[PDB]
């Protein structure tokens, strides 16, 4: 979630 | 002019000086904010809380972990934690002492350079270097080769090295860590009947996990025994006093690490990814890597993890190839020991990146002088 | 101007109590009653004066009832009287510390703030609750720093009672739990009981109550001291004597034996539900420091009865959980305390607080209301 | 000879047959024995305060009344399906199946999840469903007729909690309903005079500045009361659990995080299909408010202040007048579909052997 | 709560009769109460205390015939205390004997609530024992009330015993 | 969640209503006919026959797209030629008048009343009352439903 | 409340 895209 | 180090892991910050066999500050890395407004006058009522204070008065303060999966998310909370560490626990001004940092591999260069920039522009540190949380564990072990598997509360990675030469193409990383395990534990507890949804209850579940959770060789046999008999039902007390009983969940939890299909992830387990990484390297060094593989960081202190990993890697690899695990008792602080050793070394001094270099070249320098 | 001594006022359904700070005992305590009727019709009185009045044609009425203001006009008249006759103070050169129930609404809060800032041209004002002050009045020294903050306060006002599980100076807004008993209802019940057998109304009832009403660990296993020794049949006189009978022995049991008057749940079960609704990591402390307040609470053996009941309940629950599990847990320790403060702990705590210099800063300034208006304070 | 439908709920219970669009009977589960519609005075129990069951004997009495008074069948073999929350402790469903297989035959039940039931009811194969009952609510995603089983979400604040908060607000105002009675009247006035605020600040300013929004409601006894900001505030206490005393992000943020935890290639198909179920979801202004909250949360978390491409979101929430009985309709449809094959069910046999373990055949 | 337990829902013996209980007591008169010797746990004083306590209660739910027996005993004690106000020892005993031998047969007939005041009787095939036990219980309760309220000081009823009659058990005076 | 007043989506409709004949580029974007007709009304006032001047000035009317100086000068000349009229002949003038003319007259009367310090507003209220008593509420409801800018 | 622990 905190990868600016995926996860 | 003695150097220091501060491993800011997703579970707890381990900060301490160099040339020491054990750290000083072992304090949890959480920021708590009061749920209510507060009306008392002259008795605390601070607008924020950090460290053991949060864990103590957690029943009211909503908690937040600033860094997740090793990437930072709240820079304000991170710098607040750093200030609390440097000015309250260590009781030292970093203006007259360097600061060795730590970071996980395959992390955002933006995150790393922002960390360096804030550390240089806020604390006026003279020098600031970073490194991996695995070469430090290797140094602490005192070896010069082998593969290292870290399972910090945020991430879980494995890295091979041979005679000091790393192998980036063989490094492996995964987002599985203690937080997903605690979430799965809360889910299976709700399945049992016990509900845990808040942050203080999450910390209680994490404490339960640290206290009573093991692994076994035959997961199916253990499940059958737990479903047939009750020899595994273990009791645990809570601050309220109402004791509770837990069954097969204690060992069903780490099966997520050993079988991510439980939580939903599609990637393989630690054994399969370690075998793949080893296979990516050359056979002449695989022969030795199989003979000395070390474990480090939290999430691996479970009892029996060595036997399961040994059996799995032996079944996945040929039999004639001997295998030996290295899981000492001083693993939770292995990265700190490695950082202290490296800071105490002599040649490493020349590698310290100072203030003028950053001021004249900008943050981009960190991507060259370091790994 | 934050340098003089602040005035501490506390209105209530039963008794209004006002005085100054830095004092060991409160001042101007009286039952909060007003009496009134070229032409002005301004001749009125309050307190013991109003009580002694009504013989020459002066009406009477209670401004606040059920724990909520009802008539702002009479409330302002009462405040003006008490502030310009009883206390020869100046509302400008002194800061004010007012107390309101935890259920007071923002409309009434801002109405009071306005009628105090505008009509009385005050300078510094601070509105608070009774729970935190009553709790602060618990400890004795207040400086050793070994005091505790996590507590479960229960205030039994003369009109309404309630319970608040405070935790580290952070009041709770959900676990709050009220109850309309523990007030004048007990007096009305004792009066209805007396008017049935002995015709000789409510003054004598409250008098005999404050004189002799006590509790007993049981009632049916009790009543035996009465059946055996007639000495319990005291003789109280005002104007002749009256047979007490068993009012002194039955009245306070209304709490532990509810649904006797105008249904509810006993107090031990209520406080247990309150503590359970509260988070889990604060119950060990909430059960520890259970402080009381309100005159109607300062009974003879209230603390022992409540402690025994709550202890047996919690022990039964934990024993159920244990025998279900099979291990052995550490029996939580419940305690109760009331050290010469449950009577007027609110004013004592308010003064102890106001003694700090931070009070002058936490107050509201006149310019604040002038520029922002009457929308300064909304809720705790 | 068709199966029966029974979605035993928190406070309500609806029953019909294997195929019936509208439920044949519906009555509150409030409780010789008065279980049934006789509530119109004996003791009041309300056993199922949440998805859990406490007075299993009173639940058995209620089921007996429903099967013998509202219904005129007492079979042993007639399949009847059930409903329950997603992560309801196994003990509840175990006791339910045990009593329904011992006191009666009912060979084959196959209890299911209200989420997938309502999904069947709407006749869909993908999307997210947010059930909002009286004692609990849950959120379940689905993609291409497949359940995830790992992003399901539970949330124990709805209905009863909003009613208690409204009672506390009316107490703050002065009006008190401490009696065990009048709870149904407060529920009626809530479902009658309530609506979500599309703009909370606007509604607050309106209530503080204008005399409108203040309504007068009568009571069965005869007296009248006045209602104000509570009307538009109780949906906020639903939206803001911290106001009630629970530490949770809420509803919009909850579903947003639940979807973000999924795979990107599915996220779109979830923003395009969103269904609801439960009477608690019938609060006026709830769907559009939730849509706006989701849009704002996306704008904040992802774009960080770039409205250049916000219109290219394509969110389409779904709502209908039959969300009150979507679970019932879905149970009926599934019963009519599976009434042919008895293998998928759990017959009265194979119960004494490993009956409890047979219940594990549904949820791996 | 204020409604204490009957302390009789046990299984020491089988003295149950349809909806009443004829366990041992101190009823010196005749009736269906089987003989006994235990002179420690007297149900008479237990019921007297239960009634004196519940005189102020305002809630009482059904708890089986063992509780209906205590409810009937409390109602009879209240009726006796109310009807024996203006009398002396002689008049008290006279009124007690009248109420005992009065037109008070097995319960269920008109004079009480529809079904909550008492459960369905079992007079068919047991009316003899039912009436015997009812008469014995009525006589014992009347004698106990007379000995408690109408103490040896005849012509002067107990002040508290009479003041505790202003309330009706379950608020079912009529 | 947060509060940001999302409005970029589902834009409102403002110019769709209140059809605009402003696309002329004459007397509204260049201010030519207004400057040609205002001296005529001034000369009419000077000579005395102000009714014909008012009638000629009421022929063309500007709009409220963006310009306000020209319309303010128009309203000033209007108030002037109105104050220059006596207390009689207004009934005849309004009876021998159209409907849109009366609507524009009432609109300008209101726009003038919006600034009492710069005008008198007494003769304006008198004219409004006379128009109402002559025509009726139709003119008021028509001007209240006219363009929001004029 | 009816979860044998929390709630
Ligand atoms: N020693 C005592 N024991 C028992 N009850 C007492 C005692 N002293 C006073 N009371 C009772 O307390 C009542 C007075 O309460 P008090 O006026 O102090 O409450 P209060 O602080 O005014 O409440 P509020 O602020 O809500 O009006 C009296 O009616 C009396 O019956
Ligand atoms: N018209 C309405 N508007 C708003 N709320 C309503 C309306 N009608 C009913 N409700 C609310 O819905 C609640 C009843 O929900 P219901 O029992 O239907 O859920 P359920 O299907 O039982 O959920 P579950 O199956 O999870 O128990 C009531 O508590 C009431 O407050
Ligand atoms: N005795 C233990 N048994 C099982 N797990 C443990 C134990 N001690 C710590 N852990 C787990 O290890 C995690 C701490 O990770 P840590 O090693 O601090 O990461 P980092 O190296 O990044 O600081 C915690 O989340 C906790 O769940
Ligand atoms: Mg780590
Ligand atoms: Mg008080
Ligand atoms: Mg439902």
XYZ file of N, CA, C and O in Angstrom, chain D residues 36-104:
276
model
N -42.348 -14.445 18.823
C -43.133 -14.240 17.628
C -43.624 -12.813 17.538
O -43.087 -11.906 18.184
N -44.661 -12.618 16.724
C -45.232 -11.298 16.487
C -46.109 -10.809 17.634
O -46.659 -9.706 17.542
N -46.250 -11.590 18.705
C -47.062 -11.177 19.844
C -46.474 -9.988 20.594
O -47.111 -9.502 21.536
N -45.286 -9.514 20.209
C -44.666 -8.399 20.919
C -45.565 -7.170 20.937
O -45.491 -6.366 21.874
N -46.415 -7.012 19.925
C -47.323 -5.869 19.813
C -46.660 -4.557 20.227
O -45.502 -4.304 19.896
N -47.269 -7.750 29.728
C -45.919 -7.653 29.188
C -44.958 -8.563 29.945
O -44.736 -8.388 31.143
N -44.388 -9.535 29.237
C -43.443 -10.467 29.831
C -42.022 -9.925 29.674
O -41.811 -8.777 29.275
N -41.031 -10.752 29.990
C -39.643 -10.328 29.900
C -39.229 -10.127 28.445
O -39.741 -10.782 27.533
N -38.296 -9.203 28.238
C -37.717 -8.925 26.928
C -36.270 -9.395 26.946
O -35.498 -9.011 27.833
N -35.904 -10.225 25.969
C -34.591 -10.860 25.939
C -33.665 -10.231 24.902
O -32.561 -9.793 25.238
N -34.099 -10.174 23.644
C -33.223 -9.761 22.555
C -31.954 -10.603 22.608
O -30.873 -10.087 22.918
N -32.046 -11.904 22.319
C -30.860 -12.766 22.486
C -29.715 -12.401 21.557
O -28.578 -12.224 22.016
N -29.982 -12.284 20.256
C -28.936 -12.012 19.271
C -28.704 -10.505 19.199
O -29.141 -9.813 18.276
N -28.001 -9.987 20.209
C -27.578 -8.591 20.159
C -26.616 -8.353 19.003
O -26.629 -7.278 18.392
N -25.780 -9.342 18.693
C -24.904 -9.303 17.529
C -25.068 -10.600 16.749
O -25.983 -11.382 17.027
N -24.194 -10.843 15.772
C -24.205 -12.118 15.074
C -24.038 -13.322 15.980
O -24.285 -14.449 15.535
N -23.630 -13.113 17.232
C -23.468 -14.215 18.171
C -24.815 -14.557 18.802
O -25.758 -13.762 18.801
N -24.900 -15.767 19.351
C -26.086 -16.246 20.051
C -25.716 -16.498 21.505
O -24.669 -17.086 21.796
N -26.579 -16.049 22.415
C -26.367 -16.203 23.849
C -27.372 -17.147 24.493
O -26.978 -18.107 25.162
N -28.668 -16.897 24.307
C -29.720 -17.738 24.877
C -30.172 -18.727 23.806
O -31.197 -18.555 23.147
N -29.375 -19.785 23.636
C -29.692 -20.787 22.621
C -31.040 -21.447 22.883
O -31.726 -21.848 21.937
N -31.443 -21.567 24.150
C -32.749 -22.147 24.448
C -33.875 -21.223 23.995
O -34.886 -21.684 23.453
N -33.711 -19.913 24.192
C -34.709 -18.974 23.692
C -34.730 -18.952 22.170
O -35.797 -18.794 21.568
N -33.570 -19.121 21.533
C -33.539 -19.221 20.078
C -34.271 -20.471 19.605
O -34.977 -20.442 18.590
N -34.113 -21.582 20.330
C -34.855 -22.792 19.995
C -36.353 -22.574 20.149
O -37.143 -23.024 19.312
N -36.764 -21.896 21.222
C -38.178 -21.575 21.395
C -38.694 -20.723 20.241
O -39.794 -20.956 19.724
N -37.910 -19.724 19.828
C -38.315 -18.868 18.717
C -38.456 -19.670 17.430
O -39.422 -19.488 16.678
N -37.497 -20.556 17.154
C -37.574 -21.371 15.946
C -38.771 -22.313 15.994
O -39.435 -22.533 14.975
N -39.063 -22.878 17.167
C -40.242 -23.725 17.308
C -41.511 -22.939 17.013
O -42.392 -23.406 16.282
N -41.624 -21.737 17.582
C -42.787 -20.900 17.305
C -42.900 -20.597 15.816
O -43.993 -20.656 15.242
N -41.776 -20.271 15.174
C -41.808 -19.927 13.755
C -42.217 -21.123 12.905
O -42.935 -20.966 11.910
N -41.775 -22.324 13.279
C -42.059 -23.512 12.485
C -43.425 -24.113 12.783
O -43.928 -24.901 11.975
N -44.038 -23.765 13.919
C -45.316 -24.344 14.311
C -46.472 -23.355 14.308
O -47.619 -23.781 14.147
N -46.207 -22.060 14.478
C -47.255 -21.046 14.492
C -47.303 -20.242 13.199
O -48.357 -20.161 12.561
N -46.181 -19.643 12.796
C -46.146 -18.947 11.514
C -46.130 -19.940 10.359
O -46.748 -19.698 9.316
N -45.429 -21.057 10.526
C -45.423 -22.149 9.568
C -46.099 -23.369 10.182
O -46.153 -23.527 11.405
N -46.616 -24.236 9.313
C -47.357 -25.410 9.759
C -46.683 -26.690 9.285
O -47.350 -27.602 8.785
N -45.363 -26.768 9.436
C -44.586 -27.926 9.015
C -43.606 -28.287 10.122
O -42.971 -27.408 10.716
N -43.490 -29.585 10.402
C -42.538 -30.109 11.382
C -41.863 -31.333 10.781
O -42.074 -32.467 11.226
N -41.035 -31.136 9.752
C -40.478 -32.281 9.024
C -39.149 -32.760 9.585
O -38.615 -32.182 10.536
N -38.610 -33.826 8.991
C -37.266 -34.321 9.303
C -36.680 -34.833 7.989
O -36.897 -35.986 7.604
N -35.933 -33.968 7.308
C -35.391 -34.286 6.003
C -35.520 -33.128 5.036
O -34.736 -33.006 4.091
N -36.511 -32.269 5.267
C -36.722 -31.095 4.425
C -35.551 -30.137 4.594
O -35.357 -29.563 5.671
N -34.765 -29.964 3.533
C -33.597 -29.096 3.601
C -34.008 -27.664 3.916
O -35.033 -27.173 3.437
N -33.201 -26.994 4.738
C -33.396 -25.582 5.054
C -32.021 -24.947 5.219
O -31.213 -25.411 6.031
N -31.747 -23.904 4.442
C -30.475 -23.206 4.529
C -30.559 -22.077 5.553
O -31.630 -21.737 6.060
N -29.401 -21.493 5.859
C -29.289 -20.498 6.914
C -28.338 -19.395 6.467
O -27.801 -19.417 5.356
N -28.138 -18.421 7.352
C -27.229 -17.310 7.109
C -26.484 -16.997 8.398
O -26.926 -17.349 9.495
N -25.348 -16.328 8.256
C -24.524 -15.953 9.395
C -23.454 -14.977 8.914
O -23.173 -14.908 7.714
N -22.850 -14.221 9.827
C -21.760 -13.317 9.443
C -20.599 -14.089 8.844
O -20.558 -15.326 8.917
N -19.630 -13.395 8.241
C -18.508 -14.118 7.615
C -17.640 -14.866 8.613
O -17.393 -16.067 8.438
N -17.167 -14.191 9.659
C -16.252 -14.773 10.635
C -16.943 -15.019 11.974
O -16.343 -14.871 13.040
N -18.215 -15.396 11.928
C -18.924 -15.769 13.142
C -18.237 -16.979 13.774
O -17.973 -17.966 13.073
N -17.915 -16.942 15.071
C -17.222 -18.082 15.685
C -17.897 -19.406 15.350
O -19.122 -19.497 15.245
N -17.070 -20.441 15.181
C -17.575 -21.742 14.753
C -18.556 -22.312 15.765
O -19.430 -23.112 15.409
N -18.434 -21.924 17.036
C -19.309 -22.480 18.064
C -20.771 -22.159 17.779
O -21.654 -22.999 17.996
N -21.048 -20.949 17.288
C -22.426 -20.547 17.029
C -23.070 -21.446 15.979
O -24.125 -22.048 16.217
N -22.450 -21.538 14.799
C -23.010 -22.373 13.742
C -23.015 -23.842 14.140
O -23.913 -24.590 13.737
N -22.029 -24.274 14.929
C -22.017 -25.653 15.404
C -23.251 -25.944 16.247
O -23.960 -26.928 16.012
N -23.522 -25.093 17.239
C -24.705 -25.282 18.073
C -25.980 -25.191 17.244
O -26.936 -25.942 17.477
N -26.015 -24.273 16.275
C -27.198 -24.127 15.431
C -27.478 -25.413 14.660
O -28.599 -25.938 14.684
N -26.467 -25.924 13.955
C -26.641 -27.163 13.207
C -26.981 -28.320 14.136
O -27.805 -29.174 13.796
N -26.372 -28.354 15.324
C -26.644 -29.440 16.259
C -28.105 -29.442 16.683
O -28.772 -30.483 16.653
N -28.626 -28.280 17.084
C -30.017 -28.224 17.521
C -30.968 -28.502 16.364
O -31.968 -29.209 16.535
N -30.662 -27.984 15.169
C -31.563 -28.176 14.038
C -31.494 -29.587 13.470
O -32.406 -29.990 12.741
N -30.439 -30.342 13.780
C -30.344 -31.734 13.365
C -30.809 -32.709 14.437
O -31.155 -33.848 14.105
N -30.827 -32.294 15.703
C -31.307 -33.152 16.782
C -32.803 -32.962 17.020
O -33.575 -33.924 16.949
N -33.226 -31.727 17.304
C -34.645 -31.479 17.535
C -35.466 -31.732 16.278
O -36.661 -32.037 16.367
N -34.849 -31.609 15.104
C -35.517 -31.887 13.842
C -34.510 -32.512 12.889
O -33.296 -32.405 13.082
